[PDB]
Design a protein around this ligand. Structure first.
Ligand SMILES: [Cl-]
Ligand SMILES: [Cl-]
Ligand SMILES: [Cl-]
Ligand SMILES: [Cl-]
Ligand SMILES: [K+]
Ligand SMILES: [Mg+2]
Ligand SMILES: [Mg+2]
Ligand SMILES: [Mg+2]
Ligand SMILES: [Mg+2]
Ligand SMILES: [Mg+2]
Ligand SMILES: [Mg+2]
Ligand SMILES: [Mg+2]
Ligand SMILES: [Mg+2]
Ligand SMILES: [Mg+2]
Ligand SMILES: [Mg+2]
Ligand SMILES: [Mg+2]
Ligand SMILES: [Mg+2]
Ligand SMILES: [Mg+2]
Ligand SMILES: [Mg+2]
Ligand SMILES: [Mg+2]
Ligand code: NA
Ligand code: NA
Ligand code: NA
Ligand code: NA
Ligand code: NA
Ligand code: NA
Ligand code: NA
Ligand code: NA
Ligand code: NA
Ligand SMILES: [Sr+2]
Ligand SMILES: [Sr+2]
Ligand SMILES: [Sr+2]
Ligand SMILES: [Sr+2]
Ligand SMILES: [Sr+2]
Ligand SMILES: [Sr+2]
Ligand SMILES: [Sr+2]
Ligand SMILES: [Sr+2]
Ligand SMILES: [Sr+2]
Ligand SMILES: [Sr+2]
Ligand SMILES: [Sr+2]
Ligand SMILES: [Sr+2]
Ligand SMILES: [Sr+2]
Ligand SMILES: [Sr+2]
Lengths: 194, 237, 56, 92
RNA sequence: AGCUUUACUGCAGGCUGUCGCUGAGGACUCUCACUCCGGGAGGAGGACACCGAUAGCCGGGC
RNA sequence: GACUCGUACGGUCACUGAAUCCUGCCCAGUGCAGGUAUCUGAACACCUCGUACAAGAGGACGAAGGACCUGUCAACGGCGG
RNA sequence: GAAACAUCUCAGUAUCGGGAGGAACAGAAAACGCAACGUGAUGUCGUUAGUAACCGCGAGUGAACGCGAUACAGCCCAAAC
C-alpha cells in the first residue's frame, strides 16, 4: 500500500494547491522574520529528507536557508572593457541558488558536512531550502553503515568543492554520454569550458 | 570625466556631513499614554545649533527633562501641556482634532505619533483650516493644502525666531560661520567656471553653459544639473 | 613651498613599525594593520600570485 | 523605357519559341526560420553583435531589370540577365 | 591618452507596460499577504507599492 | 547610507556677482514642462492562419515616448539683407 | 591577433575569493548508436583529427563515438513488506 510518506511527496508536487498552499502562505510569514540560517528540529518535507539520506538519529541536523531571488548582484566595470564585457543587468552567476544555500549553511556549522538539500518554496523575493548536515565526529554516525562514509577526511568541506548532489548537477555531470565532454571528470581539467 | 560635486556629496564624507556631535536635541513631541495629564514647566531657553532658532528646556511632572521646539512667546516659568485635554494656549501640543480651526500651528506630525515633521523652521507656521472625523486640512508654509489625520499632534503658535531672513549676511565671513553649523560644502564654485572634465557646464574659451540648462527628470546623476525639470524659467510671461 | 627638500622637514611621524606577527617593519601603528603579512587584517597570511612571475 | 507585356521568344522549357508574358518579380515573404535567422538569435548578446549590428547599405542610382518570363503554353517561367533601367513600363 | 558631440557601437541610470510575490467580493468594493506610522493597543495604506524578471522610450552619466 | 538631532524663514540644483539707475524685442530651431480628438507606439495575455505540437505569418488592444497643440529666454541662444 | 575595429581572438588565460588530499576530481548507464545477432563504470596515454562542428563563413576556433594501451571492481540507500 501507499506509504504515508508518499502523501507528503504528492502534496509538494503542487505547492500552490490544496492544504499545502494554505500552509506555505502561513509559514512564510514566520520564515520572513527568521534569520538566514535557522536550524529546525524536523524536516518540512519528510519524504524528501529521508529519500536524500536523512535519519532521525544523533548527529543529523537540518537547517532552513533563505537566499535572494534573481541574477548576479554585480558592480559595473570601473576600467576599460570591450562592449561584450560591459554588461551588468543580465549577468547571472554560475552556481544555482540552492548551492549558495548549501554553502551558507555549512559555514554556519563549521564542524558539520552537507549531505544534501531540497527546496521548500519561495515568495516574490527569496527562496528557501532545507539543508541536511551530518556530524562526522559523532559516534552515532561513525557507526552508521549508511552514513559513516561522510566521515572520511576527503569528504571535508565537500560542499565547497562541489561534491554535493546539487553541486554535481550544477557542474553538468548528470549525463554520462553526449554533452559531458567538458564537464567530466571536472570543469577545471577541461579548461573551464563546461 | 570625474564625478561632479553633487556626486561626491552622497558618499557622506566629513566635508559634507552635519556637525551632529555638536547638535543638541531631536525636538520630537513627547509620547503620552492618554488622558493628557502631562504638564511641564519651562526651565530655560537655549539656542539650537541645528536650526539657528531658540528652543525651550521643559521639566515635566513625571521627572522628564527634554528640549522642545519652541513657538514664539514661551518664557521660563510658563507651564505647557501635552495631550488630548491640553488647554488651547500657545506652546501647548494636542491632536489637530482638538485644535480650533483658524489657529496657527507648528511642528505638525505627518503620521500620528511621529513627533512632528512640518513647519519647524524660524518664524513659520501651518494654518489649521478644516476639521472632520476623517481628515484635518492644514495649510503648510509653502502654501500647499495638506490633508492630515486629525490624530496628528501639533503645537499651538508660530515657531520662534521669525524674521531671521530679514537681515542680510553682508559679508562672506558671516555666511561662513553659519555654514559651519550645517551639512553643506561652501563656498560655491559655478559649474561654468570649471573644466569640461569636472562638470557638464565646464569648458569653453569663455564661460557659458554649452547646452540648455533645463535638464530632464530622467537624466542620470552626474548629468542632472542646472534647472531640474523646470516647468518654466525666467520671470517674464 | 617646494614639494621636495623643504617639505621633507616635517616628516617626524611614526607609522610603519616592527610587526608582532612577522617581524617586518610594516605594522602601521595608526591603522594597526601590517602591510607585509596582513596581521590585523586577516587571520590568513598576506600572499599574492603576482609576487612572482606567472609561470613560477 | 517601354516594354511589351507579351511577345514571342525562346522558352528554355518547351525548347521552342512561344508567347511569353513578362512580369516584375514581386518579393516573396520571409519565414524567419532560415539558418541565418537562428544565428541572429543565437549569436546576439550583451554588447555589439558583430555582423548583426550592421544596418542596410545604400542604393545604386539605377537598378537592373528584375523580371519573370512566363511561357504562355506550359506556364513555366525563366529568368534573364537584367539591364539598368531608370523606369520600366509595360505596353498593355 | 585626456576632452567633446545630433560620429559608430554599447553599458549604467530614470520613466513606462507586463509576469511573479498576489488574496476575497473598463470602472469599483474589501482584507489576509506585503509596506509604513505607533512603546503598545492600534492606525494608515493595500493586492498597489517595494523586490525579482522582461519589454518600449530617454540616456557622452560611463 | 549622506543630506538629517534638518522640514519651505528649509536645502538641494544652477546662473549672475556689493551699492545706484536699469534689465527692451523674439517660443521659429534646440531644451525643459503641461495637454492631447486623431495618428504612431514593445512585450505578456487574447483572436486568425500555419504546425496532430512547435517554429512562423497576421490581427486586435495600446503604456511611457513621438507626431500635434500650448507654456517658458534672469533656458541654450537670436536681434539681419 | 584580425595588419583599423565592434562579434571573434588573446582566454575561461593573468589575477582574485573559497576548499581538500597525498594525490585530487571522476565512476558502475534514464550510456553508446563503427545501427548491431554489436560495446558494456571511471580517469589517463596513443590515435581517431586539425576530421565533424563553430566563425564580420574573415582571422581564427575545434571535439566525440570507436580503436590500441594502462589499470581494473563493484556496491549502499529511499520505498514496498
Ligand atoms: Cl560541507
Ligand atoms: Cl543660508
Ligand atoms: Cl524591373
Ligand atoms: Cl561500440
Ligand atoms: K579586445
Ligand atoms: Mg583529472
Ligand atoms: Mg527634533
Ligand atoms: Mg562643514
Ligand atoms: Mg560661485
Ligand atoms: Mg579654468
Ligand atoms: Mg563631461
Ligand atoms: Mg561672465
Ligand atoms: Mg555667462
Ligand atoms: Mg585616442
Ligand atoms: Mg521603520
Ligand atoms: Mg567617449
Ligand atoms: Mg588589431
Ligand atoms: Mg578583415
Ligand atoms: Mg576557444
Ligand atoms: Mg559520441
Ligand atoms: Na561546515
Ligand atoms: Na559550455
Ligand atoms: Na550558442
Ligand atoms: Na592626454
Ligand atoms: Na524658440
Ligand atoms: Na594590426
Ligand atoms: Na589602433
Ligand atoms: Na565570429
Ligand atoms: Na572496428
Ligand atoms: Sr576546513
Ligand atoms: Sr525626527
Ligand atoms: Sr522617533
Ligand atoms: Sr562650458
Ligand atoms: Sr520678460
Ligand atoms: Sr610633523
Ligand atoms: Sr581587521
Ligand atoms: Sr593569497
Ligand atoms: Sr549564445
Ligand atoms: Sr546586443
Ligand atoms: Sr548611392
Ligand atoms: Sr548690481
Ligand atoms: Sr520652444
Ligand atoms: Sr573493467
Amino acid at each position: 500500500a501507499r506509504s504515508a510518506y508518499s502523501y507528503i511527496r504528492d502534496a509538494w508536487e503542487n505547492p500552490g494547491d490544496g492544504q499545502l498552499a494554505e500552509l506555505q502562505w502561513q509559514r512564510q510569514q514566520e520564515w520572513r522574520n527568521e534569520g538566514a540560517v535557522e536550524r529546525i528540529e524536523r524536516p518540512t518535507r519528510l519524504d524528501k529528507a529521508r529519500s536524500q539520506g536523512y535519519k532521525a538519529k544523533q548527529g543529523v541536523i537540518v537547517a532552513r536557508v533563505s537566499v535572494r531571488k534573481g541574477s548576479a548582484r554585480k558592480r559595473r566595470h570601473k576600467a576599460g572593457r570591450r562592449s561584450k564585457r560591459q554588461g551588468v543587468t543580465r549577468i547571472t552567476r554560475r552556481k544555482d541558488i540552492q548551492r549558495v544555500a548549501e554553502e551558507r549553511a555549512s559555514r554556519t556549522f563549521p564542524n558539520l558536512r552537507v549531505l544534501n538539500s531540497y527546496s521548500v518554496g519561495q515568495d516574490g523575493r527569496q527562496k528557501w531550502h532545507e539543508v541536511i548536515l551530518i556530524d562526522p565526529n559523532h559516534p552515532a554516525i561513525q557507526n552508521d553503515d549508511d552514513l559513516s562514509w561522510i566521515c572520511a577526511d576527503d569528504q571535508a568541506d565537500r560542499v565547497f568543492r562541489g561534491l554535493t548532489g546539487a553541486g554535481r548537477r550544477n557542474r553538468g555531470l548528470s549525463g554520462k554520454g553526449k554533452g559531458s565532454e567538458k564537464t567530466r571528470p571536472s570543469l577545471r581539467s577541461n579548461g573551464g569550458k563546461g | 570625466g570625474r564625478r561632479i560635486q553633487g556626486q561626491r556629496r552622497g558618499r557622506g564624507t566629513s566635508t559634507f556631513r552635519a556637525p551632529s556631535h555638536r547638535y543638541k536635541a531631536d525636538l520630537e513631541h513627547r509620547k503620552v499614554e492618554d488622558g493628557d495629564v502631562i504638564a511641564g514647566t519651562v526651565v530655560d531657553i537655549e539656542h539650537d545649533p541645528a536650526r539657528s532658532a531658540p528652543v525651550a528646556a521643559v521639566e515635566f511632572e513625571d521627572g522628564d527633562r527634554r528640549l522642545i521646539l519652541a513657538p514664539e512667546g514661551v518664557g521660563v516659568g510658563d507651564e505647557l501641556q501635552v495631550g488630548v485635554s491640553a488647554e488651547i494656549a500657545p506652546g501647548n501640543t494636542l491632536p489637530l482634532a482638538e485644535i480650533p480651526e483658524g489657529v496657527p500651528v507648528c511642528n505638525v506630525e505627518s503620521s500620528p505619533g511621529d513627533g512632528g515633521k512640518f513647519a519647524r523652521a524660524s518664524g513659520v507656521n501651518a494654518q489649521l483650516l478644516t476639521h472632520d472625523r476623517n481628515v484635518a486640512v492644514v495649510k503648510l508654509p509653502s502654501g500647499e493644502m495638506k490633508r492630515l489625520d486629525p490624530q496628528c499632534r501639533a503645537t499651538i503658535g508660530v515657531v520662534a525666531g521669525g524674521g531671521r531672513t530679514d537681515k542680510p549676511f553682508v559679508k562672506a565671513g558671516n555666511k561662513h560661520h553659519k555654514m559651519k553649523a550645517r551639512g553643506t560644502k561652501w563656498p560655491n564654485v559655478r559649474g561654468v567656471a570649471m573644466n569640461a572634465v569636472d562638470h557638464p557646464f565646464g569648458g569653453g574659451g569663455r564661460q557659458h553653459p554649452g547646452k540648455p540648462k533645463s535638464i530632464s527628470r530622467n537624466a542620470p546623476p552626474g548629468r542632472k544639473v542646472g534647472d531640474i525639470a523646470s516647468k518654466r524659467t525666467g520671470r517674464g510671461g | 613651498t617646494g614639494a621636495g627638500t623643504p617639505s621633507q622637514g616635517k616628516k617626524n611621524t611614526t607609522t610603519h613599525t616592527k610587526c608582532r606577527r612577522c617581524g617586518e617593519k610594516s605594522y602601521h601603528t595608526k591603522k594597526k594593520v601590517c602591510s607585509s603579512c596582513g596581521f590585523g587584517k586577516s587571520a590568513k597570511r598576506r600572499d599574492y600570485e603576482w609576487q612572482s612571475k606567472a609561470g613560477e | 523605357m517601354q516594354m511589351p507585356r507579351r511577345f514571342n521568344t525562346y522558352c528554355p522549357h518547351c525548347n521552342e519559341h512561344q508567347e511569353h508574358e513578362v512580369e516584375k518579380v514581386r518579393s516573396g515573404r520571409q519565414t524567419g526560420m532560415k539558418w541565418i535567422d537562428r544565428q541572429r538569435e543565437r549569436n546576439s548578446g550583451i554588447g555589439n553583435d558583430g555582423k548583426f549590428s550592421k544596418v542596410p547599405g545604400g542604393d545604386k542610382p539605377t537598378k537592373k531589370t528584375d523580371l519573370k518570363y512566363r511561357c504562355g503554353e506550359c506556364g513555366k517561367a525563366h529568368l534573364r540577365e537584367g539591364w539598368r533601367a531608370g523606369r520600366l513600363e509595360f505596353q498593355e
